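Quick one: structure for this chain?
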Amino acid sequence: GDVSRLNQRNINELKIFVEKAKYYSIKLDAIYNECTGAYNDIMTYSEGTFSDQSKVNQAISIFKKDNKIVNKFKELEKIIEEYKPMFLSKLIDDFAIELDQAVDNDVSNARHVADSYKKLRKSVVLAYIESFDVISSKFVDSKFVEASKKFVNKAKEFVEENDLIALECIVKTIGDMVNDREINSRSRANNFAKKEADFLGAAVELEGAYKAIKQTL
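Got it. Here's what it folds into:
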């Protein structure tokens, strides 16, 4: 029986999300580039020797100064909040609290800032996938829903290997599908090529289901 009207409403919701979230990977890269030195310094020099306390203090400053990094995470949260309300809220608060307490010089405290940052950045990537999951799950097309669950699973496995690389690939690939650009199914990576290709395989299946919907419209 014809469910064209429902399928067009589902496509509309997906296209809105993807276009609104299209800078998600660029914005997470900007956090990565500003914080990586500081994160690595905290991990290296947090061994209780105070030998490099000044380096740890400067690394904490990168994460804390002008609330800038916290606000970058809040900007990414504002994109997903419509779709996964309170997904990131707790982890953003836990980071904010650790940053406050890091004024107390301590090796543990700084390590907790670094750990809290790493956990929150991974959750920001997962929140993109969790938002796609919720949108996909409103589709009335069973073949699209089945392909979506597989895309979500392979997306989360890719994240386990590397959060930012997975997010970059997920954002470009779903972008290509909703803008009717043929998905490239091949990884040319020297790191994570197996997991990338597995995810691209699930994306090609989803593109097939999506195109089958579009040809009924």
